[PDB]
Amino acid sequence: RRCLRRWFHFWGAPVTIFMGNVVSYLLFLLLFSRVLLVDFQPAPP
Amino acid sequence: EQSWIPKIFKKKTCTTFIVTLCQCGRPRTAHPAVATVWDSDAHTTEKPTDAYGELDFHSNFLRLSDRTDPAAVYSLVTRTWGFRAPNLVVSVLGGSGGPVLQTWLQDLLRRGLVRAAQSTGAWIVTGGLHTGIGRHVGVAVRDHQMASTKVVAMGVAPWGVVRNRDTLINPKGSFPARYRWRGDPEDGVQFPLDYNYSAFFLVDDGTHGCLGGENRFRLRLESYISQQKTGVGGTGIDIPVLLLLIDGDEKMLTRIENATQAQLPCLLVAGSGGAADCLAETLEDTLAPGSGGARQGEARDRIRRFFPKGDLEVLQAQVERIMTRKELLTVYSSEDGSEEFETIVLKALVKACGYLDELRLAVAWNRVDIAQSELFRGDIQWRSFHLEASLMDALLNDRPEFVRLLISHGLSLGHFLTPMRLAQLYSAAPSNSLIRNLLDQAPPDVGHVLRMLLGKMAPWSDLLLWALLLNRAQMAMYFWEMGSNAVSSALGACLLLRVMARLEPDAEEAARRKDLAFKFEGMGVDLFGECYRSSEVRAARLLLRRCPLWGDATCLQLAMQADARAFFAQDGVQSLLTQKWWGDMASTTPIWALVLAFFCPPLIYTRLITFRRCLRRWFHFWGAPVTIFMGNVVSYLLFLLLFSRVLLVDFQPAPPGSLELLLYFWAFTLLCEELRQGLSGSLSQRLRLYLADSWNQCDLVALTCFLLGVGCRLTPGLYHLGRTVLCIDFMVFTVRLLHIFTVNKQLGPKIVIVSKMMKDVFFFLFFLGVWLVAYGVATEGLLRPRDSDFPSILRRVFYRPYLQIFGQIPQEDMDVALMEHSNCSSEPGFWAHPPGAQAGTCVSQYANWLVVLLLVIFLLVANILLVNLLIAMFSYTFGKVQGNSDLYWKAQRYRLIREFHSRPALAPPFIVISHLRLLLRKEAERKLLTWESVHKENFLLARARDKRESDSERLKRTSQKVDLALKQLGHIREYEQRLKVLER
């Protein structure tokens, strides 16, 4: 399918993989910060 | 590439056979089962060829039948095989009995023939075999090529004589080919192909070996090639084809007779041997007396040629037929080995033709020296049409050396250039070219093309325009030197080349146009510099004058639109711009003097400012761009002061007072002035250009927030939001003071450099942002404050670490040793109470030595390492971009000065009056051109003299002179030795 080929072309490009990883890493740091500052407690995780 | 070759070219097989051994040469047993006197047409059948391909010893080869149309062959060589069209074809005949030739003969081939063929880009068509004259030509080509530090030679050989025919046979095609020319057996039945030749034509006649089967095809090919025209279609002359004969035999006299019947010049080498000197002596007889001359030919045939066929009258009859067309025959005068081949060829060609002209032949080849000698011949008189026809050939074929020489020999360009002549020149656009496509979209109709490119903005001017469009760099160079307008033409050429460079589909071509544009821009700089230093006043009149030929626009307009930064960077242009900046007042007027006159209008009539007469002086002062700039600067500062007073004091929730209404009216006139600039600077296209500029974007933002803020303050519930927008709005308005002061020479370059520094700032922010997140979160996580409110967390993570860079370190908020210990929190651990309000109610004491350590590391990395790194990057960037930024501002200076010239003289607070007024609504020139032209010739002469006196040119001239000494010395040695032997 031409639509499927275009879909894989966009998400298979190195730049979009780089952008996807950068966005994911920033979200990971935000989750890490939220857990450390607030969600961390002596209670079980 | 190989698909159509078997389709059009037909190989020939024996088919029916007549005899064991057939008369066709094939074995009688080795024949098809279907198989008086053997006939090539009757006894053979035609099948698609199976030997086409490229040889590797790369050289091309092909198998073709004798009865083949030469037109298909010529198209294959010129287009498919990539060989260039020949400017000359030398058909080197020759029997050359014995593997070794006379020393002068081999000298003539290597020094006279091959050198001439390489110089004129000619073709050499001999038998493509390692025997006879073919080997001697091949070694001559190889010997010259090695010593030259490539000649194109074609070989026409009969199939059935080539050694190792089988390895070449491949019906699909053999693009790589393996051949063996070092075969151990040595027999005269078959010969190998010569490795020096570039292309081969294995003519097939269904024979397993014979000589002379390719003569019919070879003669047809030479005759057809002589019918083609040299270069750019039919404009050029017919391709000259001549036959060179060395020695020979009885069969070769038949070849000469056939060539003359085909109207082909023949060049006979005197003293070569039999079948060549026989015709040379016959030509030497010329108008021999009738008595005692008839028997001379018969005796000469027996004397020169071999005894067989001498008694037979066919030889004498054939020679008699040869002399019937003796106008085509010339004899190579030995002249003790003249080796001056090209001149003898020219004499042979012009004599044979009896239209073709000697000058056209020189233009057809790339030999300027031949044309120089022909033109310098005082005895020969040249007609006007002789120069006119030759000049077109140089112009169409892009020969800059010839057109310069032809013009210098008293050629009237005015009568030469005609609309029919001009149409042919523009028809020379090569295939898919930018000019060709524009002409197709657009009689040449060139005027329509120029208007679309430039946008509405003398034979020499037309030729310069033609050369620029076709990207003939050297031709455009020559035409500019002979033009009347030069400074405007140089800038106009730059605009045309640069705008067409943006439209170039090929990146390689666009580089050439940009390269040529840089040359034209430089010469406009050098020429104006020479003109300026002689007379500043006359040079100024040159720039502001309107050149009617280009667009009736000044040179400054052309330079500004062509982005000629180098043209604006010279002192002459900058000094003129400063003079236009000050208007009628002198450029040396002190700034403080201008300020005093501005505040005191009566002072302008006194003598402190140097320039109805009183009314004219009044309008001169207030109409000058500098006073308009000063009036706008003073008005803008007053606007900011009024804006500040309204914001800080006069702003109230009550309906607007008198001062606020004045501010609204003041801002309204500012919007009108900004709108007026955008309108006059294609409504849709103008709006796109206006929004593109970054400075216009901030201006649009500034007025947008003002409209939003004013609306909010009038709404009863949005008073607080109204002030907040205006407070930010004042920031945008104050920033615009930088844009206003871009014109000033002291602050202009510096403001432009600041923009180039933004890349370094963004890197510092990214590095600082990463470090702030890492340190801020870790410190907050270790402290674990009990407030933990989201705004409070953000402040302690980003705001507090940020302020520590600038010396605000709250030790009492992060150090346990400073705060007091308390049991505030019920959660297990040890806690201390910070004294700060936003530091949190309590913080953990568990590992505060790490919190202190992190602060030490943070201060080192941020306050020292990061800040000092940015200083290093700022210093490096400032040094790099200093030169380019200065050039950019200098180019931009003219646009800013011109903009202030069109602005109303009234201040923005009073500009509503001017806006309302805007609504409801020679012999000296020729002398200036002559003065410009005189400086151009002096500038060009100095450039030529410097090149001639350059060390490289003296070395070149000494080398050539030494060559002439060597030729003279060698002649002396030969002459002295011969004379000494003769006198002994």
Place this chain on the structure above:
Amino acid sequence: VDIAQSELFRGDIQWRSFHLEASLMDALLNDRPEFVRLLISHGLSLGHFLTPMRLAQLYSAAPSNSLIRNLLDQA
């Protein structure tokens, strides 16, 4: 090289295929870049010249304790 150039340029003298082949090895083994260029330009077929026996001799020219020689010995 000039002597070889004059000898090769002599049109009267005819050179056999093995005459060029034997000479070309001598230039190759003795590291004479000027000669091999000249010999190749005079219609020498490199395809027939290079043989595994011919190739073996070329690699045998590694000078005494050389890096290639030690690697060949280990191989």
Place this chain on the structure above:
Amino acid sequence: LLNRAQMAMYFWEMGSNAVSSALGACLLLRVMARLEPDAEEAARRKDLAFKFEGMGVDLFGECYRSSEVRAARLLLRRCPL
């Protein structure tokens, strides 16, 4: 392999693959330079490698400016030799 700089120069000019050969020659010379016991010889191999790398730069630059598309196909193509 025998570090004949001028001979390796001539053979590269007559070869079919040139851009790949120039880079391949650089890899071979540099890797064998690391294995050289003599420091003087290792310098000569590194010197010859720099010459081959430059010509690969000059040759590709000439190829690129004529046709970017064809030059691109040259780099990503696999050289079997």
Place this chain on the structure above:
Amino acid sequence: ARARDKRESDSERLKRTSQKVDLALKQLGHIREYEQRLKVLER
């Protein structure tokens, strides 16, 4: 192009001029010997 640039370089032209001058000197020396011998023989 590389070969042509080297050939047209100033150093190469100087080298070629030097060799050509040498060939002139050899030719000139032969002329002097030949002219003197012929003049003596013809006298």
